[PDB]
Design an enzyme around this catalytic site. Structure first.
Site, PDB file in Angstrom:
ATOM      1  N   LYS A 184     -45.642  41.732  16.719  1.00 45.58           N
ATOM      2  CA  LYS A 184     -44.534  41.327  15.673  1.00 45.58           C
ATOM      3  C   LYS A 184     -43.140  41.573  15.966  1.00 45.58           C
ATOM      4  CE  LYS A 184     -47.902  39.638  12.937  1.00 45.58           C
ATOM      5  NZ  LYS A 184     -47.763  38.192  12.906  1.00 45.58           N
ATOM      6  N   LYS A 214     -54.595  31.357   8.424  1.00 42.18           N
ATOM      7  CA  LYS A 214     -53.884  30.546   9.802  1.00 42.18           C
ATOM      8  C   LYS A 214     -55.142  30.644  10.818  1.00 42.18           C
ATOM      9  CE  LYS A 214     -50.424  33.307  10.380  1.00 42.18           C
ATOM     10  NZ  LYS A 214     -50.604  34.041   9.169  1.00 42.18           N
ATOM     11  N   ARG A 262     -49.782  47.281   8.350  1.00 38.97           N
ATOM     12  CA  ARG A 262     -48.393  47.291   8.335  1.00 38.97           C
ATOM     13  C   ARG A 262     -47.780  47.887   7.196  1.00 38.97           C
ATOM     14  NH1 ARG A 262     -45.776  43.382   7.502  1.00 38.97           N
ATOM     15  NH2 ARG A 262     -47.384  41.540   7.230  1.00 38.97           N
ATOM     16  N   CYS A 306     -53.609  34.745   5.158  1.00 41.82           N
ATOM     17  CA  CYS A 306     -53.610  33.463   3.997  1.00 41.82           C
ATOM     18  C   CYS A 306     -54.211  32.055   4.737  1.00 41.82           C
ATOM     19  CB  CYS A 306     -52.289  33.129   3.686  1.00 41.82           C
ATOM     20  SG  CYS A 306     -51.663  34.522   2.417  1.00 41.82           S
ATOM     21  N   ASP A 344     -51.297  32.698  15.425  1.00 43.09           N
ATOM     22  CA  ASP A 344     -50.321  33.879  14.602  1.00 43.09           C
ATOM     23  C   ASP A 344     -48.815  33.396  15.010  1.00 43.09           C
ATOM     24  OD1 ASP A 344     -50.327  36.188  12.720  1.00 43.09           O
ATOM     25  OD2 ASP A 344     -49.395  37.157  14.746  1.00 43.09           O
ATOM     26  N   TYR A 346     -51.983  51.585  14.086  1.00 44.19           N
ATOM     27  CA  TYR A 346     -52.430  50.001  13.575  1.00 44.19           C
ATOM     28  C   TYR A 346     -51.592  49.109  14.315  1.00 44.19           C
ATOM     29  CZ  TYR A 346     -52.942  45.891  10.772  1.00 44.19           C
ATOM     30  OH  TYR A 346     -53.018  44.575  10.624  1.00 44.19           O
ATOM     31  N   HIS A 379     -44.127  32.428  12.709  1.00 42.31           N
ATOM     32  CA  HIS A 379     -45.323  33.121  12.333  1.00 42.31           C
ATOM     33  C   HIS A 379     -46.143  31.965  12.288  1.00 42.31           C
ATOM     34  CE1 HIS A 379     -47.572  35.987   9.286  1.00 42.31           C
ATOM     35  NE2 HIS A 379     -48.109  35.820  10.361  1.00 42.31           N
ATOM     36  N   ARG A 386     -60.057  44.629  11.343  1.00 36.68           N
ATOM     37  CA  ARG A 386     -59.579  43.545  12.330  1.00 36.68           C
ATOM     38  C   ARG A 386     -60.714  43.541  13.340  1.00 36.68           C
ATOM     39  NH1 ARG A 386     -54.823  40.414  10.990  1.00 36.68           N
ATOM     40  NH2 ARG A 386     -53.927  41.330   9.332  1.00 36.68           N
ATOM     41  N   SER A 406     -49.376  36.578   6.212  1.00 32.29           N
ATOM     42  CA  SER A 406     -50.617  37.256   6.803  1.00 32.29           C
ATOM     43  C   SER A 406     -51.815  37.317   5.902  1.00 32.29           C
ATOM     44  CB  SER A 406     -50.085  38.862   6.965  1.00 32.29           C
ATOM     45  OG  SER A 406     -48.946  38.807   7.480  1.00 32.29           O
TER      46      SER A 406
HETATM   47  N1  LIG Z   1     -60.729  30.253  -0.139  1.00 29.13           N
HETATM   48  C1  LIG Z   1     -60.343  30.159   1.231  1.00 29.13           C
HETATM   49  N2  LIG Z   1     -60.111  31.411   2.044  1.00 29.13           N
HETATM   50  C2  LIG Z   1     -59.829  31.181   3.394  1.00 29.13           C
HETATM   51  C3  LIG Z   1     -59.530  30.207   3.836  1.00 29.13           C
HETATM   52  N3  LIG Z   1     -59.168  30.408   5.017  1.00 29.13           N
HETATM   53  C4  LIG Z   1     -59.077  31.711   5.296  1.00 29.13           C
HETATM   54  N4  LIG Z   1     -59.739  32.280   4.272  1.00 29.13           N
HETATM   55  C5  LIG Z   1     -59.888  33.673   4.082  1.00 29.13           C
HETATM   56  O1  LIG Z   1     -58.665  34.542   3.886  1.00 29.13           O
HETATM   57  C6  LIG Z   1     -58.538  35.574   4.669  1.00 29.13           C
HETATM   58  C7  LIG Z   1     -57.392  35.407   5.667  1.00 29.13           C
HETATM   59  O2  LIG Z   1     -57.984  34.193   6.545  1.00 29.13           O
HETATM   60  P1  LIG Z   1     -57.240  34.252   7.950  1.00 29.13           P
HETATM   61  O3  LIG Z   1     -57.461  32.606   8.628  1.00 29.13           O
HETATM   62  O4  LIG Z   1     -57.624  35.463   8.744  1.00 29.13           O
HETATM   63  O5  LIG Z   1     -55.440  34.475   7.769  1.00 29.13           O
HETATM   64  P2  LIG Z   1     -54.463  34.975   8.675  1.00 29.13           P
HETATM   65  O6  LIG Z   1     -54.554  36.443   8.772  1.00 29.13           O
HETATM   66  O7  LIG Z   1     -53.018  34.241   8.251  1.00 29.13           O
HETATM   67  O8  LIG Z   1     -54.832  34.344  10.014  1.00 29.13           O
HETATM   68  C8  LIG Z   1     -59.942  35.786   5.226  1.00 29.13           C
HETATM   69  O9  LIG Z   1     -60.591  36.828   4.583  1.00 29.13           O
HETATM   70  C9  LIG Z   1     -60.613  34.274   5.064  1.00 29.13           C
HETATM   71  O10 LIG Z   1     -61.960  34.488   4.663  1.00 29.13           O
HETATM   72  C10 LIG Z   1     -59.545  28.732   3.123  1.00 29.13           C
HETATM   73  O11 LIG Z   1     -59.285  27.922   3.606  1.00 29.13           O
HETATM   74  N5  LIG Z   1     -59.959  28.923   1.624  1.00 29.13           N
HETATM   75 MN   LIG Z   2     -54.871  35.548  11.473  1.00 33.28          MN
HETATM   76 MN   LIG Z   3     -49.733  37.298  11.332  1.00 35.42          MN
END
Ligand SMILES: Nc1nc2c(ncn2[C@@H]2O[C@H](COP(=O)(O)OP(=O)(O)O)[C@@H](O)[C@H]2O)c(=O)[nH]1
Ligand SMILES: [Mn+2]
Ligand SMILES: [Mn+2]
Ligand SMILES: [Mn+2]
Ligand code: NA
Length: 611
Positions: A238, A284, A81, A282, A305, A229, A258, A399, A280
């Site tokens: 989004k 989820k 994005r 972090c 999401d 993308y 979100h 992705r 994003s």
């Molecule tokens: N250290 C840590 N890393 C995490 C955790 N959950 C997800 N991650 C990592 O952070 C990145 C984003 O996670 P994701 O669940 O895909 O985030 P989303 O995009 O908000 O769904 C990925 O590379 C994961 O490996 C956690 O509980 N602890």
């Molecule tokens: Mn995600």
């Molecule tokens: Mn998102």
């Protein structure tokens, strides 16, 4: 012969379209000048032939190790994005973002109707020349549901059509569900009309210089130019389900957020649903389909999401997932970290900007699977890769686009048009210092303030570099459809409506320094939240909210974890924190900051001064 594009229709029929759908298609066929028009039916045969076409064109590569999985590699300029080229058009600036005291607003980007018209005329006339205009009828939410909102996406990217088939309910059944009703008008073009005036990189059509993702809520239109993308081109996600939807939600009395939606069941069989807003990349997706390490416990996934939420007659905050799949970050995903994802992504799944093993498999950083000797890796840049090169094999924001119905723990009510009753809302981000593992808000108003105070290290999901701690209130900084102050007022107003069973509000930090292993181990924090919703005496009052008491968290199998550092509340950090929140909210929210948010700020400042 009129403005009749019947002669260029290659699948379906303009006569079979609803009256206003036909006008929308033909009007933009006149502007964009596609050579063909493909009205999508959403069938498996269409999907197969579309993939076969992209394969023949050199747009995607088939992954021979898996069941109907494909790999797209993009231009490196078009990987995420881009918030600075993401705009909302309204008559008054104040409706879209609050007027800041200094410089520009960080809560969105406003563009006048005059500015956008000139930008629109510089981009779209003749932009699809030599290409097929695909017409995607898609439904956000389940087919049939009165909650569901239908859209029509026009695009010249077959990558977008394939991805939309996964991320939405797409096809002829949507047109039949629509009839002469209202739909969101989504217009997309990669912005490279044939013959190409500029060289094509990695066989990926895009136009970085003119990239622009515009939202016109008054006109019920999403107009997106230059980028392929997913975040910029899958306009149901989004653009519609957060930006356009959040404004509609404000006007009609619901919420578009979100947020993941998950169901959690204790050993007894008692089930609760939670929603969680993290920024994003972090956590989820990993939380929404976690494998809980605590025996007896069971996590199920409704969505990862986007959440649309509304109170029912009984006062329950009811959530649905408007999406049909997961557009999840690739790196880090393993059998250790996210095993439910790996059982999902092994079939009918499209991968973008990940590495390829010589035997037709996928590879990325933190996949946690050593290869057989002799197996070589092609990178996302289409080079032969080895760890001696300092660059990663997959792009950081690479992705997977996978069907949700294929998730082993997909919630049996994930397509329920009444929704699932939310008893807890969780806020959080990447804070490497200061913020405890978990705390609980003291009231709805403090809870809303906690959402507004959210900060998090920047990620690869947008353009922001350096891992710097940015402001991301409600994880919605890039996605507010309208004035954030009004958004805060809308949230606060939910306390005033009779019989409302308001969810408990929590704040988490998985990423303090990591002092907490995370992933499946976060089930221990989810246990505490489960109990606090039930009303167990497991909380100690601190200035920032309730924390778990001594011996409240199940840390059995985790004696090594430093509980003092992980739950330490420093007066020095927190008196700095409230100062930084004050200045932000005054600068950025300004006259539209509701009094109650300022009261929580003064109350939190007060409590910290007594330490
Ligand atoms: N250290 C840590 N890393 C995490 C955790 N959950 C997800 N991650 C990592 O952070 C990145 C984003 O996670 P994701 O669940 O895909 O985030 P989303 O995009 O908000 O769904 C990925 O590379 C994961 O490996 C956690 O509980 N602890
Ligand atoms: Mn995600
Ligand atoms: Mn998102
Ligand atoms: Mn109030
Ligand atoms: Na390509």
């Amino acid at each position: 012969n009129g403005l009749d594009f019947s002669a260029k229709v290659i699948q379906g029929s303009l006569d079979s379209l609803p009256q206003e759908v036909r006008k929308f298609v033909e009007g933009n066929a006149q502007l964009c000048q596609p050579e063909y028009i493909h009205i999508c039916d959403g069938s498996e045969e269409e999907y197969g032939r579309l993939l076969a076409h992209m394969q023949e064109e050199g747009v995607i590569r088939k992954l021979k190790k898996y069941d109907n999985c494909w790999l797209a590699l993009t231009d490196p300029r078009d990987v995420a994005r881009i918030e600075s080229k993401t705009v909302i058009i309204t008559q008054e600036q104040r409706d879209t973002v609050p007027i800041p005291k200094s410089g520009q607003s960080q809560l969105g980007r406003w563009m006048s109707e005059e500015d956008f018209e000139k930008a629109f005329n510089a981009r779209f006339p003749g932009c699809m020349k030599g290409r097929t205009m695909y017409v995607i009828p898609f439904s956000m939410g389940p087919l049939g549901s009165p909650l569901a909102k239908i859209g029509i996406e026009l695009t010249d990217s077959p990558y977008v059509v394939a991805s939309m088939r996964i991320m939405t309910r797409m096809g002829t059944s949507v047109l039949e569900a629509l009839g002469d009703g209202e739909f969101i008008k989504c217009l997309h073009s990669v912005g490279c009309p044939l013959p190409l005036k500029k060289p094509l990189v990695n066989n990926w059509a895009c136009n970085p210089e003119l990239t622009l993702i515009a939202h016109l809520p008054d006109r019920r239109e999403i107009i997106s130019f230059g980028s392929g993308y997913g975040g910029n081109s899958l306009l149901g996600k989004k653009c519609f389900a957060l930006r356009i939807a959040s404004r509609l939600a404000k006007e009609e009395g619901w919420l578009a957020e979100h947020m993941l939606i998950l169901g959690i069941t204790n050993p007894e069989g008692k089930k609760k649903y939670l929603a969680a807003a993290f920024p994003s990349a972090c956590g989820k997706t990993n939380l929404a389909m976690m494998n809980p390490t605590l025996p007896g416990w069971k996590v199920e996934c409704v969505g990862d999401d986007i959440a649309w939420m509304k109170f029912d007659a009984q006062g329950n905050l009811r959530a649905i997932n408007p999406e049909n799949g997961f557009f999840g970050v690739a790196p880090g995903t393993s059998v250790k970290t996210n095993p439910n994802a790996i059982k999902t992504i092994q079939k009918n799944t499209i991968f973008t900007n990940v590495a390829e093993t010589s035997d037709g498999g996928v590879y990325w950083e933190g996949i946690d699977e050593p290869l057989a000797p002799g197996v070589t890796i092609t990178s996302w840049k289409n080079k032969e890769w080895r760890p001696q090169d300092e660059e990663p094999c997959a792009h950081p924001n690479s992705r997977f686009c996978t069907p949700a119905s294929q998730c082993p723990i997909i919630d049996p009510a994930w397509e329920s048009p009444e929704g699932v009753p939310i008893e807890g809302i969780i806020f959080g981000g990447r804070r490497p210092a200061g913020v405890p593992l978990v705390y609980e808000a003291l009231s709805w108003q403090h809870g809303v303030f906690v959402g507004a105070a959210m900060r998090s290290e920047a990620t690869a999901a947008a353009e922001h570099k350096g891992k710097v701690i940015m402001r991301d209130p409600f994880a919605m900084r890039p996605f507010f459809g309208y004035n954030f102050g009004k958004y805060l007022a809308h949230w606060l107003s939910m306390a005033h409506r009779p019989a409302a069973k308001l969810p408990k509000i929590f704040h988490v930090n998985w990423f303090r320094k990591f002092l907490w292993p995370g992933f499946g181990e976060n089930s221990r924090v989810l246990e505490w939240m489960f109990g606090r919703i039930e009303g167990e005496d497991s909380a100690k009052l601190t200035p920032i909210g309730y924390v778990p008491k001594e011996d409240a968290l199940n840390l059995k199998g985790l004696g090594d974890v430093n509980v003092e550092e992980l739950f330490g509340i420093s007066k020095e950090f927190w008196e700095k924190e409230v100062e930084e929140i004050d200045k932000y909210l005054e600068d950025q929210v300004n006259a539209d900051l509701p009094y109650e948010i300022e009261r929580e700020l003064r109350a939190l400042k007060q409590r910290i001064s007594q330490m």
